[PDB]
Amino acid sequence: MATYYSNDFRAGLKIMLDGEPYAVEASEFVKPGKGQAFARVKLRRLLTGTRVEKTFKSTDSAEGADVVDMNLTYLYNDGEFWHFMNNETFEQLS
Amino acid sequence: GIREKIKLVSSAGTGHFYTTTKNKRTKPEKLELKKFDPVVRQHVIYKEAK
Amino acid sequence: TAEIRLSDLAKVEGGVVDLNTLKAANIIGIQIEFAKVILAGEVTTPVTVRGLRVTKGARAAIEAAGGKIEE
Amino acid sequence: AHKKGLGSTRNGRDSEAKRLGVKRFGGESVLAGSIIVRQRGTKFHAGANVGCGRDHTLFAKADGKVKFEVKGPKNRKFISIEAE
Amino acid sequence: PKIKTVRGAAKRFKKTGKGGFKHKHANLRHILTKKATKRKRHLRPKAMVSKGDLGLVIACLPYA
RNA sequence: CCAUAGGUUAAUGAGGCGAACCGGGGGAACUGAAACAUCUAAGUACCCCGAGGAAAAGAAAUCAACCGAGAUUCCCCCAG
RNA sequence: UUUUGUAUAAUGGGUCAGCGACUUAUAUUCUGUAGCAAGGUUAACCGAAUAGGGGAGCCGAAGGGAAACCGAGUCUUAACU
RNA sequence: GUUUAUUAAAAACACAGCACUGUGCAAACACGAAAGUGGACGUAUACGGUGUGACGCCUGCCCGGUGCCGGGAGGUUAAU
RNA sequence: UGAACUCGCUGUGAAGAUGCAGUGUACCCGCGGCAAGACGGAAAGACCCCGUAAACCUUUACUAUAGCUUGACACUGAACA
RNA sequence: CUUUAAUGUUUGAUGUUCUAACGUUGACCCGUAAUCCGGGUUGCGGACAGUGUCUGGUGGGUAGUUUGACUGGGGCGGUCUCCUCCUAAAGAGUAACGGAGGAGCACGAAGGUUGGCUAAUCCUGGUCGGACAUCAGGAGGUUAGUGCAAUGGCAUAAGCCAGCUUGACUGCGAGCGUGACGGCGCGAGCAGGUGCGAAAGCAGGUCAUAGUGAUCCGGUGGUUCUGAAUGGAAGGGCCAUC
């Protein structure tokens, strides 16, 4: 369980909301006089995944999980489902 | 974070148990340590559980 | 439950001691179902105790004055 | 009146002080089990009738007077107790 | 009207023989397996209330 | 068609007011919790109906403890 | 009056007279005091009643334990030097 | 033309026109714990809402976000 | 509108003096004028901050709810596919 | 697993028909000199709709409230807990938005014990071979290492390897140190029970200090400790613990 306000996630930090979990590509920061600060966070969808655009204010946080991206090795095909293979821990995957 | 906790269930008739932490993703086998039992007053080998 | 000293023991009525006649002496109460006798000191009369729970020391004290304790 | 922007400070972190040091000084009659010296490393080593806790804490193992030595080839400080 | 005793204090203390109060230590509800055995033995029996926080206990319960 | 609904006349009874008390219908918020949503405030304030000199309840499908007490209301306790 | 600090150019008061602010009930606690004293005291109520009856009750003399229990001991403990 | 009566009369609002959309009439919608009225003793050349504001020339591209509309297969899903 | 027998100056001072210290000038008292001062009068600053103050307004802030909407039961039945 | 029926299926999904519930803000008749309402045939609807209870979705149309603090004004930015050093003025303690770094762990061996060992980096010689692999020798001296920052520390080594093992064990604990307190920290030794060493002895974690949060509520296991008349159980209590 993690927390990330809009002054924390800036690039390559996954967020989780309802879901599906998204990814931040690039963002700017505006701290304007009279009013609250915000950030034009250009998010990126992960599942479908085309795009989503939100303008988060100083509130609020979002759950960051999961982030993990790593190199795999394809070796197997059977019917519908496929599998992969690691080289740093040698663990199966579906 | 990584190192979760386990429950050392006594293999004797008592319901006493020790608890400790073991990293499952390094040595995935069970622990068979041999400690004191405050109920039977024996030196029973303990077995790993959740 | 209620605890009873050895001072308020020679004034029950006569010699007999039970849950009643200690209730009339107003030293235990009305809602009492269990009563005991505890070594507290200075018992004189041959007190007869029936149905109470005399711990250890008043049994060596009431019999030292001439009493008999039964269940 | 104009007001320019102000920076930040990365510093500003300190600990609770651990109250280390010599507790009972020399020629002071102590009871058995009294802490004599709290220290991180063994600045003072344990001499006669003085033990060493796991915290490198030199504790008294008998009654008597705290005594400081300069014994040893490496010129180090020991702490002894003359049993009184 | 009479004084109403705070019920959160009467269920956490008990009157001793000479006016003092005993209490239960508070470290004993969760992740204790990170603590040592010596920390989990001296917190098991009851201990007395220190005199620095004794006047608050007497004031919050007059009857007991 | 019968009969009703409806119409007219008579008989007796009711309408309205009142200082508080009582039963039922409806029912807040400020405040307290050092904020606040549960809760407290409080079934209080108030609105409405109805009855009396008092009103309401009331002669156990009740407690009790394995011994017994015999409807209701009110006061002191039990007990913060 | 409020303040680290006021002749302060800090606040208040035109002056007079009248009124105007630490209380009341019920609990509990401590000191002083009075009565009785290992015992003390009655509450409502009957009452030709601030008299006398009324001991229902409250507090103290025994504590320890979470509790059953045990008792000048007791709890923790298989037992405690 | 109208408006901040009591410091702002305007570039504000209104306006005919235009377009989207709702509504087949016991209409939509509004008021009302409800019955009932408005809409209307009208009924799509009618009515309600929204945006723009005579007129002349015009009003381009984007359906991802959000809202609306349509389809129902598959997945998740309440009381029962 | 505290009381005044109510000067200029430089300096000190809660940090810009008719009252303090030094020094200078000035008989006592009105009327007509002018507004530099008495941090003049009038409004417990409108701005700023503080208060675990209030008020409305906004929204994909939180928990709710009117209304709209779906399904089951109820009023609610009978023949066949 | 699937295509395929025979069956008692469990029953839903709709789709026609019928009328007697219900709708009728259709006409006609009457109460009635009455476009309200009520009764009467009849016509069209029709078990749909509509309403009530339960329930999911939608819901600023509306209501109750929250929207942190330090701060060389508020804001903005930054910090909030813990650890090392300096500021800190030769005990301790000591502030600032003062100078600098780290932590929200790891381990069943990297713990316990017994036995044995002593580095860094240069220099020379040496197959591939080089600034840097391994080997041989010396100078050199702990400038090395210590699971991880920093100070303190360590050669009797806490640094490194191996054999054997689980004392990283239960009930205590005289005593003091440090805190307003909640708490934290050291603890000889006793009792039971093991480990290693022939033996003396050592071990209730790791060289030490960071690796962590109080309560309430809730879950698992054990223990008649209680258990609303009794005998049980539920729920509580204790203990281990999430």
Ordered DSSP codes for D32-82:
TT-EEEE-SS-SEEE-TTEEE-TTS-EEESSSEEEEEE--TTTT-EEEEEE
CA distances, A33 to each of A30, A38, E55 (Å) = 10, 12, 52
Contacts by D37-40, CB closer than 8 A, 24 or more apart: D37/D79
Closest CA to A56 of A3, A6, A15: A6
Residue C65's identity, in one-letter code, is: A
CB A42 within 8 A of CB A26: yes
Token pair for B19: 């608890």
- Chosen from E30, E31, E32, E33 to mutate, greatest number of chain B CBs within 10 A: E33
CB D39 within 8 A of CB D77: no
How many other CB atoms are found less than 10 A from the CB of residue E43? 15
* CA pair distance C48, B28, nearest whole angstrom: 74
Q: Which nucleotide lies closest to C55 by the C1' atom and the CA atom?
A: G71
Is some CB atom of chain E closer than 8 A to the CB atom of B21? Answer: yes
CA angle D69, D71, D77 (to 5 degrees): 55
3-class SS at E53?
helix
From chain E, the residues in CB contact with B19 under 8 A are 33
In a 10 Å sphere around its CB, with 0-12 CB exposed, 13-18 middle and 19+ buried, how is residue C22 labelled?
A: buried
Total CB pairs under 8 A between chain B and E: 4
- Measured in angstroms, what separates residue D1's CA from nucleotide G12's C1'? 35
Is some CB atom of chain B closer than 8 A to the CB atom of E33? Answer: yes
Header resolution in angstroms: 3.7
Token pair for A39: 């950030």
Superfamily of domain B1-50: Ribosomal protein L33 (2.20.28.120)
Task: Indicate yes or no: strand H within 7 A of the C-beta of A45.
Answer: no
- Measured in angstroms, what separates residue A9's CA from nucleotide F60's C1'? 74
Structural biology method used: cryo-EM
Chain E residue with minimum CA distance to B7: E33
Sheet holding A38-44, edge to edge: A14-15, A22-27, A38-44, A52-57
CB D47 within 8 A of CB D65: no
Residue with tokens 């008597």: D64
* CA pair distance A28, A38, nearest whole angstrom: 9
Our separate counts of H helices and E strands in chain E read 2, 3
Residue with tokens 């008739």: B13
Give me the residue spans of the domains in chain B. Answer: 1-50
* CA pair distance B22, A8, nearest whole angstrom: 33
Q: Which helix (H) or strand (E) holds C16?
A: strand C16-17
In a 10 Å sphere around its CB, with 0-12 CB exposed, 13-18 middle and 19+ buried, how is residue A34 labelled?
A: exposed
In this complex, which protein residues place their C-beta within 7 A of any atom belonging to strand G?
B 38-39, 41; C 1, 3, 5, 7-8, 26-27, 29-30, 34, 36, 38-40, 53, 55-58; E 1-3, 14-17, 22, 44-46, 62-63
Is some CB atom of chain E closer than 8 A to the CB atom of B23? Answer: no
CB D31 within 8 A of CB D65: no
Q: How far is CA E36 from the centre of its chain?
A: 23
